[PDB]
Amino acid sequence: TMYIAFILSTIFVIGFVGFSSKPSPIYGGLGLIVSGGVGCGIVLNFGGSFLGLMVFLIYLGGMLVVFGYTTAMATEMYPEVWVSNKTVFGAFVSGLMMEFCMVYYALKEEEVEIIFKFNGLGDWVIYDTGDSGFFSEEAMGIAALYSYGTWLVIVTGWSLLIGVVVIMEITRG
Amino acid sequence: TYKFVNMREPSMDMKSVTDRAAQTLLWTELVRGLGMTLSYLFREPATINYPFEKGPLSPRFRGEHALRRYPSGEERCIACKLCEAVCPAQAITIEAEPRADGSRRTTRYDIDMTKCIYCGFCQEACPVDAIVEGPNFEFSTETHEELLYNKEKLLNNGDKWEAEIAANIQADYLYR
Amino acid sequence: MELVQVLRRGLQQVSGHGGLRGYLRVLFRANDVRVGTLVGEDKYGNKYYEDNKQFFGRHRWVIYTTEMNGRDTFWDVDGSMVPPEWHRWLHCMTDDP
Amino acid sequence: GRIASFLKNAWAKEPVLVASFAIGGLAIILPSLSPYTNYAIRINRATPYNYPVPLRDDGNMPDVPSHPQDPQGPSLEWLKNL
Amino acid sequence: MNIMLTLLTNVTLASLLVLIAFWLPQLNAYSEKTSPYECGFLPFSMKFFLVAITFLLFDLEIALLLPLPWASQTNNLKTMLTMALFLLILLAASLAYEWTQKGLEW
Amino acid sequence: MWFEILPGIAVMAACLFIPGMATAHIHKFTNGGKEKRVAHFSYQWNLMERDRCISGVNRYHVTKGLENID
Amino acid sequence: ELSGEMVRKCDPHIGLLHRGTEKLIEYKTYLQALPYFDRLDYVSMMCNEQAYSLAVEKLLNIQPPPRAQWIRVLFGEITRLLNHIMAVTTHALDIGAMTPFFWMFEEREKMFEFYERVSGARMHAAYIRPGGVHQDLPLGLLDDIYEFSKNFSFRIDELEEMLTNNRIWRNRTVDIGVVTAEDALNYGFSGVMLRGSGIQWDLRKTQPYDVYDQVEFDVPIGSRGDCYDRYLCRVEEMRQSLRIISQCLNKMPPGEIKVD
Amino acid sequence: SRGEYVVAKLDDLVNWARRSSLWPMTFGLACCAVEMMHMAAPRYDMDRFGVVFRASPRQSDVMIVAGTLTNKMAPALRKVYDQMPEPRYVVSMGSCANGGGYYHYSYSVVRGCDRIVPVDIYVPGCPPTAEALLYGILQLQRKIKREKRLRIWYRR
Amino acid sequence: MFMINILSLIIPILLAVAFLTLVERKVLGYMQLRKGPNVVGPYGLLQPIADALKLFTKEPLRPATSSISMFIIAPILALSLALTMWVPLPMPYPLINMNLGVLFMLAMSSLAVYSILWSGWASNSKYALIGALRAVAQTISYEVTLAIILLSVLLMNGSYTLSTLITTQEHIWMIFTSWPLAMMWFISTLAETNRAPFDLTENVEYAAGPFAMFFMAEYANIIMMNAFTAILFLGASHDPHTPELYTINFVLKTLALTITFLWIRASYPRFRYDQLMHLLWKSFLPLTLALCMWHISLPIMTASIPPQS
Ligand code: SF4
Ligand code: SF4
Numbered sequence A: 001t002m003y004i005a006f007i008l009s010t011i012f013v014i015g016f017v018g019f020s021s022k023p024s025p026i027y028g029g030l031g032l033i034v035s036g037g038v039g040c041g042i043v044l045n046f047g048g049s050f051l052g053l054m055v056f057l058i059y060l061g062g063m064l065v066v067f068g069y070t071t072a073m074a075t076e077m078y079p080e081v082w083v084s085n086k087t088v089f090g091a092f093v094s095g096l097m098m099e100f101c102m103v104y105y106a107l108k109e110e111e112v113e114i115i116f117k118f119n120g121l122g123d124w125v126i127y128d129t130g131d132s133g134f135f136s137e138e139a140m141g142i143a144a145l146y147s148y149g150t151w152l153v154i155v156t157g158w159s160l161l162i163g164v165v166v167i168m169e170i171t172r173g
Numbered sequence B: 001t002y003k004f005v006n007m008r009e010p011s012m013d014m015k016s017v018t019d020r021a022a023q024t025l026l027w028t029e030l031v032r033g034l035g036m037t038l039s040y041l042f043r044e045p046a047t048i049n050y051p052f053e054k055g056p057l058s059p060r061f062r063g064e065h066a067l068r069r070y071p072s073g074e075e076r077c078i079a080c081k082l083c084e085a086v087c088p089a090q091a092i093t094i095e096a097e098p099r100a101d102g103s104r105r106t107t108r109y110d111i112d113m114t115k116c117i118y119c120g121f122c123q124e125a126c127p128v129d130a131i132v133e134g135p136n137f138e139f140s141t142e143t144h145e146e147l148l149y150n151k152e153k154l155l156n157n158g159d160k161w162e163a164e165i166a167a168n169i170q171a172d173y174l175y176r
Numbered sequence C: 001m002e003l004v005q006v007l008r009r010g011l012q013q014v015s016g017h018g019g020l021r022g023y024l025r026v027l028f029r030a031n032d033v034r035v036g037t038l039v040g041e042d043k044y045g046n047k048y049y050e051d052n053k054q055f056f057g058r059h060r061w062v063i064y065t066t067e068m069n070g071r072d073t074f075w076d077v078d079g080s081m082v083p084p085e086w087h088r089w090l091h092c093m094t095d096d097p
Numbered sequence D: 001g002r003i004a005s006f007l008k009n010a011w012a013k014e015p016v017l018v019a020s021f022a023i024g025g026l027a028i029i030l031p032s033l034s035p036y037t038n039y040a041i042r043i044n045r046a047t048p049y050n051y052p053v054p055l056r057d058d059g060n061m062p063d064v065p066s067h068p069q070d071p072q073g074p075s076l077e078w079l080k081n082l
Numbered sequence E: 001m002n003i004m005l006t007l008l009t010n011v012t013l014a015s016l017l018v019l020i021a022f023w024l025p026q027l028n029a030y031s032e033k034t035s036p037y038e039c040g041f042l043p044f045s046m047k048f049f050l051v052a053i054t055f056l057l058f059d060l061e062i063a064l065l066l067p068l069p070w071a072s073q074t075n076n077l078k079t080m081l082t083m084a085l086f087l088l089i090l091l092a093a094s095l096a097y098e099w100t101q102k103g104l105e106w
Numbered sequence F: 001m002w003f004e005i006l007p008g009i010a011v012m013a014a015c016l017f018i019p020g021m022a023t024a025h026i027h028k029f030t031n032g033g034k035e036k037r038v039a040h041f042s043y044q045w046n047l048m049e050r051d052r053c054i055s056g057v058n059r060y061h062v063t064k065g066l067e068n069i070d
Numbered sequence G: 001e002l003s004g005e006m007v008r009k010c011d012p013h014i015g016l017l018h019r020g021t022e023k024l025i026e027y028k029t030y031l032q033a034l035p036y037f038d039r040l041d042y043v044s045m046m047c048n049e050q051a052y053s054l055a056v057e058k059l060l061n062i063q064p065p066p067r068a069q070w071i072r073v074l075f076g077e078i079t080r081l082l083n084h085i086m087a088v089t090t091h092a093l094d095i096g097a098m099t100p101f102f103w104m105f106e107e108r109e110k111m112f113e114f115y116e117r118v119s120g121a122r123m124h125a126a127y128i129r130p131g132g133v134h135q136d137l138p139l140g141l142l143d144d145i146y147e148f149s150k151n152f153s154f155r156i157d158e159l160e161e162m163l164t165n166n167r168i169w170r171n172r173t174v175d176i177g178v179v180t181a182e183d184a185l186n187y188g189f190s191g192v193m194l195r196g197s198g199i200q201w202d203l204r205k206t207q208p209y210d211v212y213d214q215v216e217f218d219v220p221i222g223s224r225g226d227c228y229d230r231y232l233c234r235v236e237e238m239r240q241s242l243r244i245i246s247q248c249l250n251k252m253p254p255g256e257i258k259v260d
Numbered sequence H: 001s002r003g004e005y006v007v008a009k010l011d012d013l014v015n016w017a018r019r020s021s022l023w024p025m026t027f028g029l030a031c032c033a034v035e036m037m038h039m040a041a042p043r044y045d046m047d048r049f050g051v052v053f054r055a056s057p058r059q060s061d062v063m064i065v066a067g068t069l070t071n072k073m074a075p076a077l078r079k080v081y082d083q084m085p086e087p088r089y090v091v092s093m094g095s096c097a098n099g100g101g102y103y104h105y106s107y108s109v110v111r112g113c114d115r116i117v118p119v120d121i122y123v124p125g126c127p128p129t130a131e132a133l134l135y136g137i138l139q140l141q142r143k144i145k146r147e148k149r150l151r152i153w154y155r156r
Numbered sequence I: 001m002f003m004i005n006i007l008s009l010i011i012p013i014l015l016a017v018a019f020l021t022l023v024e025r026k027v028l029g030y031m032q033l034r035k036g037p038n039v040v041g042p043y044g045l046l047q048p049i050a051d052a053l054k055l056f057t058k059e060p061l062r063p064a065t066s067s068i069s070m071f072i073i074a075p076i077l078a079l080s081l082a083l084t085m086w087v088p089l090p091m092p093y094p095l096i097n098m099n100l101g102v103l104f105m106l107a108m109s110s111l112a113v114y115s116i117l118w119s120g121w122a123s124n125s126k127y128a129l130i131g132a133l134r135a136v137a138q139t140i141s142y143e144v145t146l147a148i149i150l151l152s153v154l155l156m157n158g159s160y161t162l163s164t165l166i167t168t169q170e171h172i173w174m175i176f177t178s179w180p181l182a183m184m185w186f187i188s189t190l191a192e193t194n195r196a197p198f199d200l201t202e203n204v205e206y207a208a209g210p211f212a213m214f215f216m217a218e219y220a221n222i223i224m225m226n227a228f229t230a231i232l233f234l235g236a237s238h239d240p241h242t243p244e245l246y247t248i249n250f251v252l253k254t255l256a257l258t259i260t261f262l263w264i265r266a267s268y269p270r271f272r273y274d275q276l277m278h279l280l281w282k283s284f285l286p287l288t289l290a291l292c293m294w295h296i297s298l299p300i301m302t303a304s305i306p307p308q309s
């Protein structure tokens, strides 16, 4: 279980290939839910509990659920799987093969370099030895948004409100 | 002579408006209804324990048709066939011939209970109290053919239920 | 308090059905465990009980016999097992047993 | 006058909104007009999340407490009373 | 490993029950209902999508409102309070815009 | 009457009672007859890891007191 | 034809229970035709018989005996309770409120016993026959009717306690299916439909039949024409029916039960 | 034998489950539906026996034909019946459902629902009293209790 | 031993759901002057077993699923998420103690929504999709108000840790401090589980086993939500030496809340989609926002900011 993070990252890539093959929307949405869940697992493994639950509650919970909502109401497609017609099947298989080639060139060869330099050592090495005491670094920093990042709060809130306005103006016909 | 349902103006007294808003916000009437159902919970249930307990019934109850006999043992039916005529569903089929003795005894008294409406006109028409709807309501069958009752079936039903049928007639003949 | 009286009455009902065995027997054969005066028993074996205290509809009840006309009725309590003479009293057509 | 009637009409017709505006409004005005807000700030600062890194005594720091527990230094007695 | 074990056990239990409910009960022979799904041939009303996009945006604003419990421990209580009230006021303003204008049609 | 519902509610109550009791008992049984320690922050875990080393049997439940010193 | 969630054209297709009763009546005698009317409205049985009985009596140029007329009205109002219970409870049941249905249906079971005590059948009675009623009331029937009516008012109030003031019930009934008074008359609406819109019309008052002229009651009148007002009207009709029932139980005259 | 004993006991268990938790669908067509409601009314309370009125015909086990099956309604009855899952039992309530009753000679009345769908229990009456309908259901329960589907499969 | 704990959390909940079916039947009946299941076993104690056995023997009909794959995943997701939501709950000691257990619960409920969408879409049934989308709309509105209420009440808890709620409510139940939020929270929980009056009567294509599992998942969610309400507002005394006391009190509270769920089910007429959303958008949401403002300002203005740790 020392390479659990690497396994999760590979599964993340696999799910990305799955939904990036542009399959039937329903099957793709799943290809994204699976990858999203994996990514949350990776973030939790690095210690980002709040951010891990963030994607699960917002991205997977709401963003992808509204995406599915649309696919369900505007359903004009013939259902097909990732291993369906060659257009999707070949793309999925080729993506998996490219990922597997990267993995082999990464583990068997320690210093793998395609566009960036990568080291085959387990990601556990990058973890830093330190103690936060009675602290949640992630939580404390994110809560500092209300104290330090007042400007960020203002801009993000204005963007949200104007987003509601824009959505209504667009979907008024 | 006529009553105005609804048609009640709401008072705009600040106290009245306050109580109305209290009803809206604090959900008072919903709580009242909830309490009513809770009261119904602690009442005594009205379910009878069938078939160990049977529901109330009156002596005038109309059920399974039955052919009766005189105390001597002779079939009361004298083949007048007026019960066949009165039957609003044309369910009774009566064919009669002079018996060996010479009396008007039916050779066929067939009533398909699957067509009878259990109106009771037959028992009201019979001039000798021969065909009388019995007290048995639980005579469900598994095949359609069984519902069609022969004369023999009617005679057997009469012989089986005679005690109750006679008691009920004795308890109701004065009203009729 | 009256709660103790209720529990005691339950135990009395347990005793009145002839011990725990009979109490369970009436519980699992009739789904009712109240007791009443044995008005009478037909020849087939069905026993008829009446309790005026119970509300109309449950004042009179019949415990069906185990064996009737060469048929096991320990669990198969047919509604037509009631004899004609008892039918009047059980169905409240008359008030005379 | 006219505003007073409007409030009565609003509570008569849409009491939920009237309550929402009132609760929200108080949740803004009341904080500024409250003395315990100052205390709430002090309590947050008082809580010693991290170690109080000692300073090297130079001989010219009378106020700074060079001891475990003596009069020099901040006091949490105010909180104890609260 | 404990939480991973819980997830694995729950998922496997559910999948096993789905197996014993989808393939085991259909083993029993029940003749054959030679009954075709007679089909012989779109309500994409905005009434539904609007409920969805508005929910997405309100959920986004709720996401910004999540770190509030830890944000109450900040020394700059006034600033944090002002920002929190600002975010809540913006949520209320978005709701009011939709309510006042042609929105909340659901 | 209404007390006839009580049997089913009691059975459900026992069913729901099983989990909490099981969790508490298993926690105490696997944590040296003590409430299972919590690590919500790194400091708490650091104490556990130190305690594990101090015990010498790689178990944090066993705690060494003044008898262990000197 | 639904615009997604809005009703544009609701075409009612009927005839799923067309049994050709009218033609069958022509092939049977007047007495034999009476049971058919019981089936027509299987919720209000004896009321159907009364209408047929009055029509035959009018053609026969005969008058039912005074006792029978009071008996007809007494059971007629009992029949009105049966339907109003059925109408309100089943309407609430379809809306979602299921508890009131069972509460009032036990009272409906009690009233069915009154039918069976006087005719021998629970629903279809054929008791009101052209010329009067089939038989006289069984000794003790009137006393039990008084007992039921005495405790029936509480039951109606319990129904109101659970529905009338309930906001969800009002939202599902208030300002729903509003019918203008003029439309109701032109569309041939009758009964609660007319009264719901405020039209002060009731045959028991305007065109008295049997001994309804000898009873005193009040006609509930709606104000808005929505379902809620008609719901209130039907409830109030149940209350006023008890008023008529009490009068009949105290004015039942001695005499025969069929025209002599 | 032991095999017969095991199969018989298992068959009894299966029979008990179905007869105890029969789920009927209310195909209320006419007057008989009213008495069916009185069966589910507090006095008789079919639910006490485990017979709960299942609105969904796709999750029902007993179709209680209550009323006059007209020619116009006849196709619907059969189509609903074949969309019921198995085991499915049909209980005919009322003379109209049994053999047309008052409308046997009508021009637009099916001469009994037996023609359209196979019937298992016929409840006589017009309308059959709620106890009689309850009696029919209990008779159907006893009918299910007698069924030996597994035993016949083993002895085949 | 940990696996034993997982089993002792999963199996009892399923049995409790099975008997909750009978409890609901009997409670509704006795509120309707009827006796619930009383023939099948003593006091109907064998009724759930009979129902389960009948269901797992009924011929399963195929609903022409556009994607069996998906049609089968929906039940699995629902049941697994329902089982998982029980894990973080502190019955005094939780199985898995998470610093952010509350957010975990919310996320699990959010994923559960997909089961609805997947079921309807794969069902290949216009009416199925319409009804599924209506369910999506209903759960959409509840999540917002539920999240806001949960955040506001946890502003006095001091964190998202579920265990801390016991300590916060050690002296006084949270409801006495936040009763309006409690009202809206309970109604929102009703809306979440589609329990009446937020049902949409008239995933039905599911046959027998599948349906049975969906039913079990829904009722387990009912029990879990009532437990969450109990822990949030109806705090219970916990003696560290004897946790059984807290377990008993908590179980009793959860049972009371489920009984209230049934009591409401047979007390009120069902809402209408427009009415349900004009509640969860135009009555609850503004009040939730105002109360969130109040529950942010109150701890600061009263110097009652709860401890972070
Ligand atoms: S009316 Fe009576 S006597 Fe005449 S045929 Fe019928 S049963 Fe016989
Ligand atoms: S009771 Fe009516 S339906 Fe039955 S045989 Fe007599 S007349 Fe015919």
Ligand code: SF4
Pocket (backbone or CB within 6 Å): B117, G039, H030, H031, H032, H066, H067, H068, H093, H094, H095, H096, H097, H101, H102, H125, H126, H127, H128
């Ligand atoms: S049998 Fe009688 S009560 Fe039943 S539907 Fe036919 S006419 Fe109506």
